[PDB]
Amino acid sequence: MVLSEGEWQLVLHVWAKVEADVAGHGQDILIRLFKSHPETLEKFDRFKHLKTEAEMKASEDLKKLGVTVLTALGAILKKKGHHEAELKPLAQSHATKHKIPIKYLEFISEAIIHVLHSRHPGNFGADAQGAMNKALELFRKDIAAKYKELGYQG
């Protein structure tokens, strides 16, 4: 697929608001993901013991990972589709070390859209959400193709 410039503008305009507080957005998203799809928590050896949202909110490590995850995603979105290099090491570790199925990337994509929708309603109307969804679908489609070359496709 290919986004237009206008669509990228809508995606990078709401992302600039996320970047004003990357750790808080990273916490919200990861907790929204673990609450909605608890099975995903299991993939995190360091955090699967967390039992409640209060514990999750208090975890320093969880917050640090949230910032790592959003910072990588931001770097990929800022490429505007030219993200082959950035996707290579990401695909290799998620397909070979962590083993994250494509279905779980669809789950965090839903959590990202849920959190932008509640924290940035003014900059995340229907056109901006459709553009963000297209951008994450592009990201998933290119990651799934890399998974396949790497021998995992999950």
Binding footprint of ligand HEM on the chain (CB under 6 A) = 40, 43-44, 46, 65, 68-69, 72-73, 90, 93-94, 98, 100, 104-105, 108
Question: What are the backbone dihedrals phi and psi of residue 48, each rounded to the nearest 5 degrees, phi first?
Answer: -60, -15
Q: Which is nearer to ligand HEM, 40 or 59 (CB)?
A: 40
Q: Which is nearer to ligand HEM, 4 or 71 (CB)?
A: 71
Instruction: Give the count of beta carbons closer than 10 Å to the beta carbon of residue 12.
Output: 16
Residue 48 Cβ vs ligand HEM, minimum distance, rounded to whole Å: 10
Q: How far apart are the first and last CA of the chain?
A: 21
Residue 46 Cβ vs ligand HEM, minimum distance, rounded to whole Å: 5
Q: Which is nearer to ligand HEM, 17 or 72 (CB)?
A: 72
Are the CB atoms for 99 and 59 separated by under 8 Å? Answer: no
Q: What residue has token string 């993901």?
A: 33
Residue 22 Cβ vs ligand HEM, minimum distance, rounded to whole Å: 13
Are the CB atoms for 112 and 136 separated by under 8 Å? Answer: yes
Q: Which is nearer to ligand HEM, 35 or 122 (CB)?
A: 35
Residue 128 Cβ vs ligand HEM, minimum distance, rounded to whole Å: 18
Instruction: Give the count of beta carbons closer than 10 Å to the beta carbon of residue 25.
Output: 22
Residue 44 Cβ vs ligand HEM, minimum distance, rounded to whole Å: 5
Are the CB atoms for 43 and 87 separated by under 8 Å? Answer: no
Q: Which is nearer to ligand HEM, 82 or 122 (CB)?
A: 82
Are the CB atoms for 52 and 74 separated by under 8 Å? Answer: no
